[PDB]
């Protein structure tokens, strides 16, 4: 149960926005220009790491 | 001299007024959602309208319940100031279809309809920002409706529950399926229900509750429909269920 709960928590945290406007990455790829989207992708990467 | 009279009583909401928070399919799962819901076992105002309180505040949202077999209830009027100054939403329901119109249809503190035909009501409309037509909302039977406005969208949820042979509101779950979301973007402060009288003797009975910001735990069966729900702040047992994300709580002490 502990192993399953840890994996489920990881996959759930994959959907947290961590202050960014959106949680989907391919969405923000086709959404925004690079220089302004880099900060939000940095927030996502920091949260996921 | 008092043409309009409305007798108000109090009743128990039981476990009623839960709807689908979003149009996303889920199966065999428990989902916790924070939104405007009708609190479980809350006080619901039962209004008997017989031909002076016409001001029903809208608050966050409204839960309407109709239970008459006679199909005597027809439409709604939603308005902030309910005068010609501000635009208002109006609903028309007849056997053929339903017509939603954001129009300043001027009615006094006693709105109604003529009945047969109702062509005598309005010759024309002054302004109409938004219009819509559809198959009629209404089809004993319990018509449960939920109205709200969030981020500029006005959303309606509905459920036409075929009640078994029994008197009052059952202790069962009727998850209200959404019907129409209109991007109207108008302020709303008060609402009024339009009783149907023909041309006179006539009466109506309805239930009104007010939604509140609450966190709920919803159960989806293997088919996708909601079977049960838990209101977290109702009692400590429900809070324990919400914390554990399980409808069955084992023996122990839970923070």
């Amino acid at each position: 149960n502990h192993n399953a709960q840890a994996l489920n928590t990881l996959v759930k945290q994959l959907s947290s926005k961590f202050g960014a406007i959106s949680s989907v990455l391919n969405d923000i790829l086709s959404r925004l220009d690079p220089p302004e989207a880099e900060v939000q992708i940095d927030r996502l990467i920091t949260g996921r790491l | 001299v008092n043409l309009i009279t409305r007798t108000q009583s109090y009743t128990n909401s039981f476990t009623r007024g839960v709807y689908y928070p979003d149009k996303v399919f889920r199966s065999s799962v428990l989902h916790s959602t924070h939104d405007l819901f009708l609190p479980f076992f809350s006080n619901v105002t039962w209004f008997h309208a017989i031909h002076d309180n016409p001001a029903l505040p809208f608050n966050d949202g409204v839960y309407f319940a109709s239970t008459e077999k006679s199909n005597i209830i027809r439409g709604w009027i939603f308005g902030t100031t309910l005068d010609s100054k501000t635009q208002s939403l109006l609903i028309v329901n007849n056997a053929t279809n339903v017509v939603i119109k954001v129009c300043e249809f001027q009615f006094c503190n006693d709105p109604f309809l003529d009945v047969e035909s109702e062509l005598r009501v309005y010759s024309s409309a002054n302004n109409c920002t938004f219009e819509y037509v559809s198959q009629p909302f209404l089809m004993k039977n319990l018509r449960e409706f939920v109205f709200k406005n969030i981020d500029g969208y006005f959303k309606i949820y509905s459920k036409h529950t075929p009640i078994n042979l029994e008197r009052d509101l059952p202790q069962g779950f009727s998850a209200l399926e959404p019907l129409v979301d209109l991007p109207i973007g108008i302020n709303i402060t008060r609402f009024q229900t339009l009783l149907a009288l023909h041309r006179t003797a006539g009466a109506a009975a309805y239930y009104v509750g007010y939604l509140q910001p609450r966190t709920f735990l919803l159960k989806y069966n293997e088919n996708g429909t909601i079977t049960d729900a838990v209101d977290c702040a109702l009692d400590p047992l429900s809070e324990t269920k919400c914390t554990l994300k399980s409808f069955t709580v084992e023996k122990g002490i839970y923070q």
Binding site: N8, V11, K12, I21, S30 | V24, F25, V29, D151
Partner: protein, 294 residues
């Protein structure tokens, strides 16, 4: 050593079929843009959003998009489009920008921090400037409090600043809240009339029904294909799904909060999405001294 992925063979895009095109030719070329204090708010939905007609007009003075990349307008699908049309002076057009404050920003039209949309401003001096002067264009420079985003203030609130109201006559601290724009053609850049349309692209988890000229591709099954369903893009294999959606929801999710099923806009069947094969690659080797076989 490495990780193995099955690269997508094809790309399928499924957008709902609407013959009607959006009235983009009406929000522009309207020969009348009302005024800034009462700016026209038009709703755009359930139509083809062809952004080429926007570029088909005169070279724009300022085509600045904040939350959306301008080149990606056709690819992206939006729920609702709010066209906010008005006319302002040129120097105030630059006031609609992050970090920049101005009278128009706070007392005429305010944008939210997470505003996803486009500001399109172009001159109409050769078409909307007259020697007499268009006195219809007026702005309200006085308000009790600041304007929250997406708010319009047109009610004549009782502005009793002093003890005695001016009562319609001139006096100290008695000025008209509505200031008519001075449209003199001899004036240079910074005072000429400019038509500004703010296309607010409000999108959320709802049937968008507003996409763009994208020829839909035939549906494929049992092949890792880049699917674009109503703006939801992903990589996976599509299979005919046994699960029965209720008539009103279009996406499916599992206990992991991931998109697992999708309802096709054109034909109403439920498709299960399975991620195409991914894995790790291990190199089983003896010592490099013994042999190089792996």
């Amino acid at each position: 050593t490495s990780n193995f992925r099955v690269q997508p063979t094809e790309s399928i895009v499924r957008f709902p079929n609407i013959t009607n095109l959006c009235p983009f030719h009406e929000v522009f070329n309207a020969t009348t843009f009302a005024s800034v204090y009462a700016w026209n708010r038009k709703r755009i939905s359930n139509c083809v959003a062809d952004y080429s007609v926007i570029y088909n007009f005169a070279p724009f003075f300022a085509f600045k998009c904040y939350g959306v990349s301008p080149t990606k307008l056709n690819d992206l699908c939006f729920t609702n489009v709010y066209a906010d049309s008005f006319v302002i002076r040129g120097n105030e057009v630059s006031q609609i920008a992050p970090g920049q404050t101005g009278n128009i920003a706070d007392y005429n039209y305010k944008l939210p921090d997470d505003f996803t949309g486009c500001v399109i401003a172009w001159n109409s001096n050769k078409l909307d400037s007259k020697p007499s002067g268009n006195y219809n264009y007026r702005y309200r420079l006085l308000r009790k409090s600041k304007l929250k985003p997406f708010e319009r203030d047109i009610s004549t609130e009782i502005y009793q600043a002093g003890n005695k109201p001016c009562n319609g006559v001139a006096g100290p601290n008695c000025y008209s809240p509505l200031q008519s724009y001075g449209f003199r053609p001899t004036y240079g850049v910074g005072h000429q009339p400019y038509r500004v349309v703010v296309l607010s692209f409000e999108l959320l988890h709802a049937p968008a029904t507003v996409c763009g000229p994208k020829k839909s591709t035939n549906l494929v099954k049992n092949k890792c294909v880049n699917f674009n369903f109503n703006g939801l893009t992903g990589t996976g294999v599509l299979t005919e799904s046994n699960k029965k959606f209720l008539p009103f929801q279009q996406f499916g999710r599992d206990i992991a909060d991931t998109t697992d099923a999708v309802r096709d806009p054109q034909t109403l069947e439920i498709l299960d999405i399975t991620p195409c094969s991914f894995g790790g690659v291990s190199v089983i080797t003896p010592g490099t001294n013994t042999s190089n076989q792996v």
